[PDB]
Amino acid sequence: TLTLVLDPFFWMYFSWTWLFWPWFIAVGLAGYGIYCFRKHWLGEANAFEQLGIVTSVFTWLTLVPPAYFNGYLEGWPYVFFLAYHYFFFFNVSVRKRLYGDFYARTHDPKWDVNTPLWSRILFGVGIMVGHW
Amino acid sequence: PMETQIISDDTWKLVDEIWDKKVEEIKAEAVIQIEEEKKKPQILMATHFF
């Protein structure tokens, strides 16, 4: 570790990767998002991890493609990244104000409509395709 | 003696019934009361949106 650090040539080559400090975060957070998605699929997700799941989806939707195509993000993509999160955090407030907390309650199994999983994945993939 | 039988033999059956129901309810309540798997926050409610 020490001969890695105090070597000026590793400082010339490891600071050679700061140009893509924007691209260190935007992909490294995706691994956290998918890991938390698997953890929630098992059934052990805290609030921060599920927030990170929707954040992973929403950020990877809005900000990544124009940053990839033009190399500079200034303006509307920022405010729509804000607007999407401001949009999805609306079931939380209504289902917390007139409730005790966010814990799922007991009800009949037939009430909630389900829909085949392939169609759900197709919807997500089509949403990605349309955004890109 | 002049007093014949009083309230019933069926009311004794009913009070035996309620005694047994309460005893069985206590027996069930004693041993299966505590079991917990998890209480995880449901903050990915997709049925509202997705």
The 3-class secondary structure across B8-36, one letter per residue, is CCHHHHHHHHHHHHHHHHHHHHHHCCCCC
Task: Count Cβ neighbours within 10 Å for each residue of A64-98 and write b for 16 or more, e otherwise.
Answer: bebeeeeeebeeebeebbeebeeebeeeeeeeeee
> Is B48 in Cβ contact with A112 (below 8 Å)?
no
* Owner of token pair 């999407």: A84
As a whole number of angstroms, the distance between CA B50 and CA A117 comes to 12
The experimental method, as deposited, was: cryo-EM
* Chain B residues within an 8 Å CB radius of A92: 43
CB-facing half-sphere around the CA of A75: CA atoms within 13 A:
4
Task: Please give the residue of chain B at the shortest CA–CA distance from A124.
Answer: B50
DSSP letter, residue B40? -
As a whole number of angstroms, the distance between CA B5 and CA B12 comes to 13
Q: Does B38 touch chain A (CB under 8 A)?
A: yes
Q: Mutation target for A interface from B38, B39, B43, B50: give the one with most A CBs within 10 A.
A: B43
Distance from A5 to chain B by nearest Cα, in Å?
43
